[PDB]
Enzyme design. Structure first.
Site, short mmCIF file in Angstrom:
data_model
loop_
_atom_site.label_atom_id
_atom_site.label_comp_id
_atom_site.label_asym_id
_atom_site.label_seq_id
_atom_site.Cartn_x
_atom_site.Cartn_y
_atom_site.Cartn_z
N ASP A 90 0.84 -1.19 0.00
CA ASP A 90 0.00 0.00 0.00
C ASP A 90 0.88 1.24 0.00
O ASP A 90 1.61 1.49 0.96
CB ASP A 90 -0.93 0.00 1.22
CG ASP A 90 -1.80 1.23 1.29
OD1 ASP A 90 -1.94 1.92 0.26
OD2 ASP A 90 -2.34 1.51 2.38
N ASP A 128 -2.65 5.29 -5.06
CA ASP A 128 -2.81 4.39 -3.93
C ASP A 128 -2.86 2.96 -4.44
O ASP A 128 -3.83 2.56 -5.09
CB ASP A 128 -4.07 4.74 -3.15
CG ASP A 128 -4.03 4.23 -1.72
OD1 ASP A 128 -3.25 3.30 -1.44
OD2 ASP A 128 -4.77 4.78 -0.88
C1 9JD Z 1 -4.70 -2.71 3.73
C2 9JD Z 1 -5.63 -1.74 3.10
C3 9JD Z 1 -7.01 -1.90 3.57
C4 9JD Z 1 -7.46 -1.22 4.69
C5 9JD Z 1 -8.76 -1.38 5.13
C6 9JD Z 1 -9.63 -2.23 4.47
C7 9JD Z 1 -9.20 -2.94 3.35
C8 9JD Z 1 -10.13 -3.85 2.61
C9 9JD Z 1 -10.62 -4.98 3.24
F1 9JD Z 1 -10.22 -5.21 4.51
C10 9JD Z 1 -11.47 -5.87 2.65
C11 9JD Z 1 -11.87 -5.62 1.35
C12 9JD Z 1 -11.41 -4.50 0.67
C13 9JD Z 1 -10.55 -3.60 1.28
C14 9JD Z 1 -10.05 -2.37 0.49
O1 9JD Z 1 -10.94 -2.14 -0.60
C15 9JD Z 1 -8.63 -2.55 -0.10
C16 9JD Z 1 -8.12 -3.99 -0.21
C17 9JD Z 1 -6.63 -4.04 -0.46
N1 9JD Z 1 -6.21 -3.12 -1.51
C18 9JD Z 1 -5.84 -3.55 -2.72
O2 9JD Z 1 -5.58 -4.71 -2.99
O3 9JD Z 1 -5.79 -2.54 -3.59
C19 9JD Z 1 -5.35 -2.90 -4.93
C20 9JD Z 1 -10.35 -0.97 1.24
C21 9JD Z 1 -11.82 -0.69 1.54
C22 9JD Z 1 -12.02 0.67 2.20
C23 9JD Z 1 -11.31 1.76 1.42
N2 9JD Z 1 -9.92 1.38 1.16
C24 9JD Z 1 -8.86 2.12 1.56
O4 9JD Z 1 -9.01 3.17 2.16
C25 9JD Z 1 -7.46 1.62 1.23
C26 9JD Z 1 -6.44 2.75 1.27
O5 9JD Z 1 -6.51 3.47 0.04
C27 9JD Z 1 -5.00 2.18 1.30
N3 9JD Z 1 -4.30 2.36 2.58
C28 9JD Z 1 -9.85 0.12 0.43
C29 9JD Z 1 -7.88 -2.76 2.92
#
Ligand code: 9JD
Ligand code: 9JD
Ligand code: NAG
EC number: 3.4.23.15
Length: 333
Positions: A35, A219
């Site tokens: 990330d 990101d």
């Molecule tokens: C470790 C980052 C993170 C934090 C919190 C929740 C999740 C998560 C999760 F647990 C379960 C499903 C989906 C998500 C996310 O869709 C991103 C999944 C991995 N990113 C990936 O492969 O991008 C190619 C997040 C859902 C909420 C909004 N997101 C973020 O804020 C991620 C930030 O941009 C990165 N720190 C994505 C992932």
């Protein structure tokens, strides 16, 4: 050093891209998302209560099983848009690709069900700068620079379309196999975050948003592209998309006819066709298809800003340059 090493990534439904890292002696395996939006490395801990279901479903780190483990124990709390994780700091040897480093990382003892019961990954490897690191702990990539093994101080990302290679990250350079042409580079507004000036956002022929300029956070952990609620509300209205509880949807048959979306960066137009940003499960007019865009309001100092996530990276191979403080873009293949 001449070293450039690559880590293979597993693509889960074009949302979650993760890879494998070893920790300690003997190496303990973990599936982690790389990330660029966070500077901390953390994995689930064996000291995590089983009352948190995520620590049951995911793999846990056992400190007493590694002879290279070094106790630290300082409290650590990481805040995301989704919520908070808690734990304590630890230090052990981390293997990524062909590179090994002694690294300070978090051991998470609190893992909320939402989101993390939906996570196919165990943990996170922050690729961001130390400026964003909670506790000011040296990020993993900075420790790699210090080793001077890398051919270059840059690292790149490749995300593929689900359907074959899932995805690849290269430490020390880029892989010409997965991009065509040459990289177009854009400087970072400032050090400490991977963010670049965006000169506007276009729907079809007219540029309807970000008219005077806005911020774009590249990101690699972002699943979708996300803008401020104000921006997105106007974007979806222009696309005729409808808001659900979670996502924005459109009639699956109308998806292919939606206009293009272009992001203007470094004087160049970066376009995503409806085929790029729409999930098409069916083309039926009786079903609704999810859009790969939604609204997330990022608080300052980082926000308000756009986030260019896997939706954007999928089409454009991305190179992150630490030495020159810039981000390269090339057409992905
Ligand atoms: C470790 C980052 C993170 C934090 C919190 C929740 C999740 C998560 C999760 F647990 C379960 C499903 C989906 C998500 C996310 O869709 C991103 C999944 C991995 N990113 C990936 O492969 O991008 C190619 C997040 C859902 C909420 C909004 N997101 C973020 O804020 C991620 C930030 O941009 C990165 N720190 C994505 C992932
Ligand atoms: C599917 C409805 C929906 C809409 C918005 C958010 C979530 C959500 C959520 F609330 C909590 C965790 C994870 C997710 C998603 O990981 C997307 C997160 C966005 N990340 C981001 O913009 O990072 C910057 C989804 C989890 C299930 C699989 N996903 C899909 O989009 C599947 C579609 O239904 C396929 N047509 C992603 C879910
Ligand atoms: C057990 C241990 O090493 N604790 C250290 C502490 O002494 C140090 O002041 C701090 C600075 O990062 O990090 C932690």
């Amino acid at each position: 050093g001449n070293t450039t090493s690559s880590v293979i990534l597993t693509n889960y439904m074009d949302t979650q891209y993760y890879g494998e890292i070893g920790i300690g002696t003997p190496p303990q395996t973990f599936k982690v998302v790389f990330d660029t939006g966070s500077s901390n490395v953390w994995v689930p801990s064996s000291k995590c209560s089983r009352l948190y279901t995520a620590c049951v479903y995911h793999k846990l780190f056992d400190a007493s099983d590694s002879s290279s483990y070094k106790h630290n124990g300082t409290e650590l709390t990481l805040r995301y848009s989704t919520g908070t994780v808690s734990g304590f700091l630890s230090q052990d040897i981390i293997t990524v690709g062909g590179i090994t480093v002694t690294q300070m990382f978090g051991e998470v003892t609190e893992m909320p069900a939402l989101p993390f019961m939906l996570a196919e990954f165990d943990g996170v490897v922050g690729m961001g700068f130390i400026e964003q690191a909670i506790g000011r702990v040296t990020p993993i990539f900075d420790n790699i620079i210090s080793q001077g093994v890398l051919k270059e101080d840059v690292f790149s990302f490749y995300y593929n379309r689900d359907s074959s290679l899932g995805g690849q990250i290269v430490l020390g350079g880029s892989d010409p196999q997965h991009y065509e042409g040459n990289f177009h580079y854009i400087n970072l507004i400032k050090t400490g975050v991977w963010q670049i000036q965006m000169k506007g956002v276009s729907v079809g022929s007219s540029t309807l948003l970000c008219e005077d300029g806005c911020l774009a956070l590249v990101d690699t952990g972002a699943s979708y592209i996300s803008g401020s609620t104000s921006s997105i509300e106007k974007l979806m209205e222009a696309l005729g998309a409808k808001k659900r509880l979670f996502d924005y949807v459109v009639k699956c048959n109308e998806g292919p006819t939606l206009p293009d979306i272009s992001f203007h960066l470094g004087g160049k137009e970066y376009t995503l066709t409806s085929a790029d940003y729409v999930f098409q499960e069916s083309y039926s007019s009786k079903k609704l298809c999810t859009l790969a865009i939604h609204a997330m309001d990022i608080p300052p100092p980082t926000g308000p800003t756009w986030a260019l996530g896997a939706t954007f990276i999928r089409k454009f191979y991305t190179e992150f340059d630490r030495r020159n403080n810039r981000i390269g873009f090339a057409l992905a293949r």
